[PDB]
Write a structure and sequence with these properties.
two-stranded antiparallel sheet, 13% strand, globular, Transferase(Phosphotransferase), domain 1, 9 helices, Phosphorylase Kinase, domain 1, Hepatocyte growth factor receptor, five-stranded antiparallel β-sheet, 2 domains, 7 strands, binds the ligand Fc1ccccc1Cc1c[nH]c2ncc(-c3cnn(C4CCNCC4)c3)cc12
């Protein structure tokens, strides 16, 4: 730790949570192991308010070099703040810790799939709108997500959707064992392995379809190897039963083969809020 560059240590100070400011309960995991080694934690703010947080131990980091890079992804993610983007509370420098806010209702896909929950069509569109706003912010910062899907969004106690699975919050589902999301990828990303905000617009289109089917798997009868040919033939996900026609038109524009022809996230926010506003609640 003393081995780290001093002007780099000074640059990460505003991201670092001191050991006296955080209580990690290493005896209690969040989400029955489904999200890896993620623990309940208590973060104390400057006024001593207790913040319930989710603490992840970053076991993949060992050497000085990897610590230094992690400090940089920390500085960068700490500048991203938006009501629809999962914030980084800070980092702890035992393995490095990533401190994130606690998301009461876990991931958006699991929440909508749960038989007990009954979101209305308006509630579902509202979640889509929230994602679109989170993405509009990321795109305004020229940040390409590359893995947008309903499983990669979180829901807090106020039912506020947070775009997650990026920066230090990536590899969300990395589970330990003892012994490419091609169905969300834009057609040009499947062909070139490159990602843009226009490829994120395609993935948002798929997430919208996931929201409207309450988390059904896209293209269940099509192999990931066959997705490219299926998309080149002009075949697309079909209109979900309870999905309004103007919203399905929004999903379709998202899956246009010409990247430049797809809506921008700013346009998607405009169109979805206009659609959301036609529902009583
Ligand atoms: F580990 C990560 C690593 C990187 C990014 C993101 C994450 C995930 C995460 C962050 N903050 C969280 N806060 C709560 C829950 C969670 C999981 N399950 N539950 C609930 C338990 C009762 N049943 C309904 C779900 C809540 C998960 C997370």
């Amino acid at each position: 730790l003393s081995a780290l560059n001093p002007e780099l240590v000074q640059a990460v100070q505003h991201v670092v949570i001191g050991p006296s400011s955080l209580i990690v309960h290493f005896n209690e995991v969040i989400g029955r192991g489904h999200f890896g080694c993620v623990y309940h934690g208590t973060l104390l703010d400057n006024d001593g308010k207790k913040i319930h947080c989710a603490v992840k131990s970053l076991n993949r980091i060992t050497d000085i070099g990897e610590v230094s890079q992690f400090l940089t992804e920390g500085i960068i993610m700490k500048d991203f703040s938006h009501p629809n983007v999962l914030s980084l509370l800070g980092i702890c420098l035992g393995s490095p810790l990533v401190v994130l806010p606690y998301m009461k209702h876990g991931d958006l896909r699991n929440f909508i799939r749960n038989e007990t929950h009954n979101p209305t069509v308006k509630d579902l569109i509202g979640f889509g709108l929230q994602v679109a706003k989170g993405m509009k912010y990321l795109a305004s910062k020229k940040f390409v997500h590359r893995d947008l899907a309903a499983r990669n969004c979180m829901l807090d106690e106020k039912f506020t959707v947070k775009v997650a699975d990026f920066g230090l919050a990536r590899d969300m589902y990395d589970k330990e064992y003892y012994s490419l999301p091609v169905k969300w990828m834009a057609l040009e990303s499947l062909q070139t392995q490159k990602f843009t905000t226009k490829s994120d617009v395609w993935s948002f289109g798929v997430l919208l379809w996931e929201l409207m089917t309450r988390g059904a798997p896209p293209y269940p009868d099509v192999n990931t190897f066959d997705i490219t040919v299926y998309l080149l033939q002009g075949r697309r996900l079909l209109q979900p039963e309870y999905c309004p026609d103007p919203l399905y038109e929004v999903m379709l524009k998202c899956w246009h083969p010409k990247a430049e022809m797809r809506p921008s996230f700013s346009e998607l926010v405009s169109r979805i809020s206009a659609i959301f506003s036609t529902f009583i609640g």
